[PDB]
Design a protein around this motif. Structure first.
Motif, PDB file in Angstrom:
ATOM      1  N   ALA A   1       0.841  -1.217   0.059  1.00 58.50           N
ATOM      2  CA  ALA A   1       0.004   0.068  -0.117  1.00 58.50           C
ATOM      3  C   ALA A   1       0.952   1.370   0.007  1.00 58.50           C
ATOM      4  O   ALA A   1       0.293   2.535   0.111  1.00 58.50           O
TER       5      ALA A   1
ATOM      6  N   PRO B   1       4.443   5.731  10.347  1.00 58.64           N
ATOM      7  CA  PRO B   1       4.197   6.874   9.581  1.00 58.64           C
ATOM      8  C   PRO B   1       3.978   8.135  10.312  1.00 58.64           C
ATOM      9  O   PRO B   1       3.184   8.143  11.197  1.00 58.64           O
TER      10      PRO B   1
ATOM     11  N   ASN C   1       3.198  11.081   8.419  1.00 59.02           N
ATOM     12  CA  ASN C   1       2.551  11.983   7.234  1.00 59.02           C
ATOM     13  C   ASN C   1       1.960  10.999   6.361  1.00 59.02           C
ATOM     14  O   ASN C   1       2.087   9.798   6.544  1.00 59.02           O
ATOM     15  N   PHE C   2       1.137  11.549   5.552  1.00 61.94           N
ATOM     16  CA  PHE C   2       0.481  11.047   4.683  1.00 61.94           C
ATOM     17  C   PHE C   2       0.095  11.749   3.358  1.00 61.94           C
ATOM     18  O   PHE C   2       0.340  12.922   3.262  1.00 61.94           O
ATOM     19  N   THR C   3      -0.115  10.981   2.125  1.00 60.53           N
ATOM     20  CA  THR C   3      -0.317  11.509   0.905  1.00 60.53           C
ATOM     21  C   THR C   3      -1.527  11.247   0.501  1.00 60.53           C
ATOM     22  O   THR C   3      -1.752  10.037   0.403  1.00 60.53           O
ATOM     23  N   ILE C   4      -2.424  12.031  -0.099  1.00 57.25           N
ATOM     24  CA  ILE C   4      -3.546  11.699  -0.644  1.00 57.25           C
ATOM     25  C   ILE C   4      -3.416  11.520  -2.023  1.00 57.25           C
ATOM     26  O   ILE C   4      -3.133  12.623  -3.019  1.00 57.25           O
TER      27      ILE C   4
ATOM     28  N   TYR D   1      -5.022   6.735   0.610  1.00 57.97           N
ATOM     29  CA  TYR D   1      -4.168   7.104   1.345  1.00 57.97           C
ATOM     30  C   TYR D   1      -2.927   6.418   1.327  1.00 57.97           C
ATOM     31  O   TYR D   1      -2.818   5.383   1.502  1.00 57.97           O
ATOM     32  N   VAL D   2      -1.785   7.228   1.161  1.00 62.21           N
ATOM     33  CA  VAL D   2      -0.456   6.618   1.147  1.00 62.21           C
ATOM     34  C   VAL D   2       0.333   6.938   2.406  1.00 62.21           C
ATOM     35  O   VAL D   2       0.488   8.127   2.580  1.00 62.21           O
ATOM     36  N   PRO D   3       0.985   6.007   3.158  1.00 65.70           N
ATOM     37  CA  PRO D   3       1.782   6.666   4.337  1.00 65.70           C
ATOM     38  C   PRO D   3       3.175   7.195   3.794  1.00 65.70           C
ATOM     39  O   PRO D   3       3.452   6.852   2.898  1.00 65.70           O
ATOM     40  N   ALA D   4       3.548   8.186   4.623  1.00 65.56           N
ATOM     41  CA  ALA D   4       4.880   8.774   4.397  1.00 65.56           C
ATOM     42  C   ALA D   4       5.580   9.322   5.681  1.00 65.56           C
ATOM     43  O   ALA D   4       5.080   9.526   6.690  1.00 65.56           O
TER      44      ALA D   4
ATOM     45  N   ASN E   1      -1.515   3.313  11.580  1.00 61.28           N
ATOM     46  CA  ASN E   1      -1.407   4.087  10.414  1.00 61.28           C
ATOM     47  C   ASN E   1      -0.667   5.513  10.417  1.00 61.28           C
ATOM     48  O   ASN E   1      -0.570   6.005   9.519  1.00 61.28           O
TER      49      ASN E   1
END
Ligand SMILES: *[C@@H]1O[C@H](CO)[C@@H](O[C@@H]2O[C@H](CO)[C@@H](O)[C@H](O)[C@H]2NC(C)=O)[C@H](O)[C@H]1NC(C)=O
Ligand SMILES: *[C@@H]1O[C@H](CO)[C@@H](O[C@@H]2O[C@H](CO)[C@@H](O)[C@H](O)[C@H]2NC(C)=O)[C@H](O)[C@H]1NC(C)=O
Ligand SMILES: *[C@@H]1O[C@H](CO)[C@@H](O[C@@H]2O[C@H](CO)[C@@H](O)[C@H](O)[C@H]2NC(C)=O)[C@H](O)[C@H]1NC(C)=O
Ligand SMILES: *[C@@H]1O[C@H](CO)[C@@H](O[C@@H]2O[C@H](CO)[C@@H](O)[C@H](O)[C@H]2NC(C)=O)[C@H](O)[C@H]1NC(C)=O
Ligand SMILES: *[C@@H]1O[C@H](CO)[C@@H](O[C@@H]2O[C@H](CO)[C@@H](O)[C@H](O)[C@H]2NC(C)=O)[C@H](O)[C@H]1NC(C)=O
Ligand SMILES: *[C@@H]1O[C@H](CO)[C@@H](O)[C@H](O)[C@H]1NC(C)=O
Lengths: 170, 50, 106
Positions: A118, B21, B23-26, C26-29, C67
């Motif tokens: 993911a 994580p 942070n996140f990216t939409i 939604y991508v974790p970063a 997450n």
């Protein structure tokens, strides 16, 4: 090689072009199928040199360094157990590269759980990952942690039974 | 050339470390799926015989 | 099935003889290493996270959602007790706060 036969064959039109085009479409479709199934990760993950996974044994599914083909014992058994103008085109992905893709998928799912599928691969200890999977099916984490040695023994036994069953069934 | 499968990424696995994580990216991605073809009808008598 | 990443929603768009799905995921970063433990040993009892995971930034232990990094104090409410500390492999010693304690302290 008969010129007269080809001259008579030209009267029938573009049948040969149609057949060649259809076969070419099938041939590219097979490679597309292999790409779709195996090439789902763009990072080639590798396992740590020390196989400390909290009692879980993955030797039967991880690649064997002793073998030149870099295949797992299960994969090696699987490969051993499968036996006028015609040409056979080689597949775009060779067996070692497909084995490498499976190795990358195994390394990702062992070291990172489902995180690598993911997004970025996030490391997690394997018992904790198994506990997360236990929570997914509605069983509390404590059950996994308390019975970790039993679960690892059962998993190893089942993997061995899988190898024996494949080796013993035609 | 011999094709490369992907960039190598050795995950730093250890028995007591986790990566969380911050942070996140939409991310919006596209998926194109064909639904229908052109509806073609051929008059067999007219095609073969005119 | 609905895009790369954890699927949030999708939007359909018409196309000539086709459909285009805009998958919003939604991508974790910006991930960070933390020291983790399966359980917390307090008062001879083993505490496990209800919905999260135990993380340590080096000196203090917290519980956070899996997450996203949001450290919270390990309380009685967010953990569940099952058994003592002798069974779980890798359990570490840390205090578990009780929100009822200042109420009877005052
Ligand atoms: C994981 O399982 C493998 C396979 O059962 C174990 O490898 C065996 O080790 C014993 C003792 O060293 C040998 O006598 C066998 O011949 C090995 N089998 C194979 C197929 O290599 C391995 O020891 C287990 N544990 C770990 C940590 O890898
Ligand atoms: C999380 O990542 C986002 C990236 O979208 C960060 O937002 C940026 O923050 C910088 C610093 O102030 C700004 O210059 C950018 O314009 C912001 N981008 C957007 C799209 O707003 C956000 O700060 C990051 N958060 C953390 C805690 O790292
Ligand atoms: C978490 O810690 C591990 C171990 O210190 C980090 O892995 C190393 O990262 C450095 C920096 O690029 C590399 O030079 C090493 O080769 C890495 N080791 C291994 C075994 O891969 C990891 O980068 C850290 N993760 C975060 C998010 O900080
Ligand atoms: C881990 O996080 C905790 C919580 O923020 C840190 O504790 C704080 O540290 C700062 C800086 O010394 C103090 O001003 C705060 O009062 C501390 N809070 C508490 C509740 O004690 C802790 O220092 C962090 N540890 C590391 C190694 O970064
Ligand atoms: C966590 O706390 C437990 C509980 O006190 C510690 O276990 C004690 O260990 C000492 C040293 O060997 C023994 O003398 C005590 O009898 C033990 N008590 C119990 C109830 O088992 C444990 O060592 C602590 N762990 C850490 C890492 O500090
Ligand atoms: C991790 O492994 C080390 C030895 O490699 C061991 O001393 C330590 O207790 C282990 N930690 C956990 C949580 O299993």
């Amino acid at each position: 090689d008969s010129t007269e036969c080809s001259n008579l064959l030209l009267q029938y039109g573009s049948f040969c072009t149609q057949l060649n085009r259809a076969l070419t479409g099938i041939a590219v479709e097979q490679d597309k199928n292999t790409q779709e199934v195996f090439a789902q990760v763009k990072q080639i993950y590798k396992t740590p040199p020390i196989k400390d996974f909290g009692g879980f044994n993955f030797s039967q599914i991880l690649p064997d360094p002793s073998k030149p083909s870099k295949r797992s014992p299960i994969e090696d058994l699987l490969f051993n157990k499968v036996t006028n103008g015609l040409t056979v085109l080689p597949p775009l992905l060779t067996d070692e590269m497909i084995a490498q893709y499976t190795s990358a998928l195994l390394a990702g799912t062992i070291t990172s759980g489902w995180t690598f599928g993911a997004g970025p691969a996030l490391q997690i200890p394997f018992p904790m990952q198994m506990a997360y999977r236990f929570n997914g099916i509605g069983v509390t984490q404590n059950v996994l942690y308390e019975n970790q040695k039993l679960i690892a023994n059962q998993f190893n036994s089942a993997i061995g039974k899988i190898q024996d069953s494949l080796s013993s069934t035609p | 050339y011999t094709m490369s499968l992907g960039a190598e990424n050795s995950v730093a696995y250890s028995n007591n470390s986790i990566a969380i994580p911050i942070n996140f990216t939409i991310s919006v991605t596209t998926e194109i799926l064909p639904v229908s073809m052109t509806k073609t009808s051929v008059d067999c008598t007219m095609y073969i015989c005119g | 099935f609905c895009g790369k990443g954890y699927h949030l929603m999708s939007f359909p768009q018409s196309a000539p003889h086709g459909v285009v799905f805009l998958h919003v995921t939604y991508v974790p970063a910006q991930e960070k290493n933390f020291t983790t433990a399966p359980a917390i040993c307090h008062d001879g009892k083993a505490h496990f996270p209800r919905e999260g995971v135990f993380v340590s930034n080096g000196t203090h232990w917290f519980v956070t959602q899996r997450n996203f990094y949001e450290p919270q104090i390990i309380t009685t409410h967010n953990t569940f007790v099952s058994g003592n500390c002798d069974v779980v492999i890798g359990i570490v010693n840390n205090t578990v706060y009780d929100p009822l304690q200042p109420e009877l302290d005052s």
